[PDB]
Amino acid sequence: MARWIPTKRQKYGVAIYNYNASQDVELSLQIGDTVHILEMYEGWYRGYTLQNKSKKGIFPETYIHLKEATVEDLGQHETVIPGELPLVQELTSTLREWAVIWRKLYVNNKLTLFRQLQQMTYSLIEWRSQILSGTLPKDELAELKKKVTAKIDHGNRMLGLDLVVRDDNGNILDPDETSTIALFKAHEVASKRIEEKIQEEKSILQNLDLRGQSIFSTIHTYGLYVNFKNFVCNIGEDAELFMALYDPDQSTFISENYLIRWGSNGMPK
Amino acid sequence: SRPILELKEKIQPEILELIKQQRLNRLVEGTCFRKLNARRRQDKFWYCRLSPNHKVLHYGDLEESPQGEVPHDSLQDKLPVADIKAVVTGKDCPHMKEKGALKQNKEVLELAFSILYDSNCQLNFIAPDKHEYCIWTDGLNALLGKDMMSDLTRNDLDTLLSMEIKLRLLDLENIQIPDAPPPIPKEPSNYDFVYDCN
Amino acid sequence: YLPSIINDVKLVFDPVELSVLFCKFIQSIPDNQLVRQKLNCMTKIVESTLFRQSECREVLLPLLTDQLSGQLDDNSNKPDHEASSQLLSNILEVLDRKDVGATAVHIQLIMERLLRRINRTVIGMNRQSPHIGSFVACMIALLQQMDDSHYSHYISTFKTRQDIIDFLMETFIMFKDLIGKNVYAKDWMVMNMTQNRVFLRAINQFAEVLTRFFMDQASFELQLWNNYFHLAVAFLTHESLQLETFSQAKRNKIVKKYGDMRKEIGFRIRDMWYNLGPHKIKFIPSMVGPILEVTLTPEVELRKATIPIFFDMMQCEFNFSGNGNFHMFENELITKLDQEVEGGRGDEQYKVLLEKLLLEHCRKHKYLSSSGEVFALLVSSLLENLLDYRTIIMQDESKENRMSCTVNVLNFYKEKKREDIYIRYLYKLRDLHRDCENYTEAAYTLLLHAELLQWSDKPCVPHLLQRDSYYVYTQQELKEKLYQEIISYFDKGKMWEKAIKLSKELAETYESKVFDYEGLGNLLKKRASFYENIIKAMRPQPEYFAVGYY
């Protein structure tokens, strides 16, 4: 070991498995041990670890999955798609704090919210995994962004965690001291989300029709799907089935007749 | 997932000790426990609280309290933790083998647990149902410092261990772990770091 | 709907002609017609066509200012609170735009024409439940967009010094009543932090204005520093290590984004305190305490910078020590130190650093600093006492240990004769015993207090005047109330010998000094009951055990 050279192109010090403890400064390094390496050797890397950002560890290059990227994913264009990667790092930190409060949870009879946190967690991790790829359509991108933001802020709200802003594009632009009043209105937008979902906890988590009313107040077109299975009738001849929506109060049909032909054998023709 | 499983179960103890300290908290907060044959105006409910020092047990013939534990000097605030031989669970309970007026029916077969102490005194107690019964047994073996006997405890073990390992595999995304560990590059024996330390 | 056209109308018309025409039409509105509607109108107006400003901003605004200043206080501002806030918010936002055009001088005009107005508003607009937060947002936005050169431009250059003084007073009290009793859900942490930054900027500016218009050059009217430092300290009394700690990034997040505010705040206050110069002595005893807690801040550095101010204060007294020494200083020092440490603030390293710094400082200085050295030794003894007390209190939580340590500190104070805090801990212990219903011990404690008093009529020291009730209370009367309570305790304490004993002295005092024979009668009635109890009933004998701690 010698010849160390400072660089920042090694932010993503990625292990492979629990590292051997060969170094006096290394251990069974965890899988997620993304370490801020300060000094780089060809076969080895010593620098700050996520677990202890004040303590070094010399770590094999073969063990490091080298990644030139940094916390910024656009300067080196590491983005799978721009305006999304900040979201993944923030949600990773968010899952970290989820784990911490989780630790704090089991030791307490907060089990109800604990399991609802479990299912929040499963939803969020699967969304994370599915957005690991950039395959989604831009509408899917935006919808994922919005809903995961809603869920993470929900986790924040019942847990008494602070709020974030800048709904889109990483939730970072607004906290970047761009303005003052836009900061305000963003904060109240978030508080509106808070109030929406807290009042609707007792609406959806208990009942199931207020959610339908709220969702249907947003869209106008709907389609009734009908899947015919079998006609049970004693006719013995060719039969035409004109099934359509009807208004008994208005004494008229509401949808066009869907002609279904039924054979004389008991089977549709 | 062979290296994955090896690494996973190999960093075990933290989850175990977390479970055990949770059991400790549960014992301390405790509840009103169930006596034997509390029919003829006998308090079936009575609290058994562990000390915050977890060295004495606050229990006794307490009243039918639906609120649960009341913090005070129970009828006996000491259970000698340092000398408990064991707790008998099931048929090992001598009170279950009773064939007189203290006949415990077969429906409390899994609520029979008696603390062994004084080599002749026993505490034939009853749990309201299985999960807390296993919880109290787990808490006792935690005082005993051995393995657990709650199915829910194994549940917690597997689920939380899975959660933790799952939240570690984020760095190794789009990456593979050679089941054979990667070969160690030869570290030059010289420690004369050309660059400074820290 | 007239606003709805202005965009393309501009696109096919002279801009300023439109500006003046709309201005004329609006000012032509009688002053009591559709205020809500007109404010909405000008809102839509300032929305568009203000992306260009050089020709219209300067001319459209004046009317806007006029109606908003009428909205300042015409006693009919109740319906238009939110409307005015909306107007101001939107226009300020528009101003913040950079690509739209240069507005620095226009910002100056907006300062000149609405700043005092809105400050007056918020100072009046004082109830939290309404949308006061909107006004707060508006004014902080103003201050953020504002410039320091702009700050001193006119706000420093007002009319006669009394006007600017009163303005400054109002500004400071408003800042305090904002920082104190904040306006946000405490979840808008980013917003809180931003508010802190803008408040920092503003109070900085007002610090330089104090230096340049209220230092010795203002030979008198130099009181404010009380209010000013109060505001500063209060602002220095939140957003602390633990809050920073809740997430590990939380420290890192705020530090990267903002750093340690408290660092700069304390450094600023330190240097300006040094700048106070001659008036330090005329300003020490009141403001002594207000600097301990900031010194007690959990960080390291500004603490390092702050303890020396204690030595500066004692030295300033040394300059005034022609009449005595820093006794008046150290008394308040010890007192406030006591409440704070028992409050659970300091740390061991804190006391170590205190000893180190103050001893080092006093070595450089003379005999009076040697007395200060021995008093700092006293201080460190106090500190270790208090740390021991608090650590045991938080550790065992067994009432017995609590009594043990509180007696320890009581003995130490008795040794140090600082009697007021002594009484305070006496009452603490009394509370404890009442919790344990140890009526005997409670009576002994309360007596030990009452022992201090005299049957004299003058209340000689309000130190004995405790916080239970505080007015004249001749020493006699307080002693009488104490004896009444103690006798009651002993009665329900089932130990009547001392009860009768004390009844004797109380009756003596009644007969010889107050002559209220009614109290005599009631008291002797009680004493007869006592004797009856003693002869009649029997009392169990308590066993006494010896305990060997090894």
Author numbering:
A (entry chain E): 1 to 269
B (entry chain D): 530 to 727
C (entry chain E): 819 to 1368
What text does the study give?
RhoG, another GTPase, activates the ELMO-DOCK-Rac pathway during engulfment and migration. ELMO is structurally divided into two domains: an N-terminal domain (NTD), consisting of the Ras-binding (RBD), ELMO inhibitory (EID), and ELMO domains, and a C-terminal domain (CTD), consisting of the Pleckstrin homology (PH) domain and proline-rich region.
We performed 3D variability analysis using the 3.8 Å-resolution consensus map of RhoG/DOCK5/ELMO1/Rac1. This analysis revealed several continuous movements within individual protomers of the DOCK5/ELMO1CTD/Rac1 core region. The resulting structures of classes 1 to 5 differed from one another in dimeric molecular dimensions. Structural differences were due to the conformational changes between the armadillo repeat domain and DHR-2 in DOCK5, accompanied by a shift in the PH domain of ELMO1. Consistent with this theory, our cryo-EM single particle analysis reveals that the DOCK5/ELMO1CTD/Rac1 core region is highly flexible and can, therefore, readily transition to a flatter conformation.
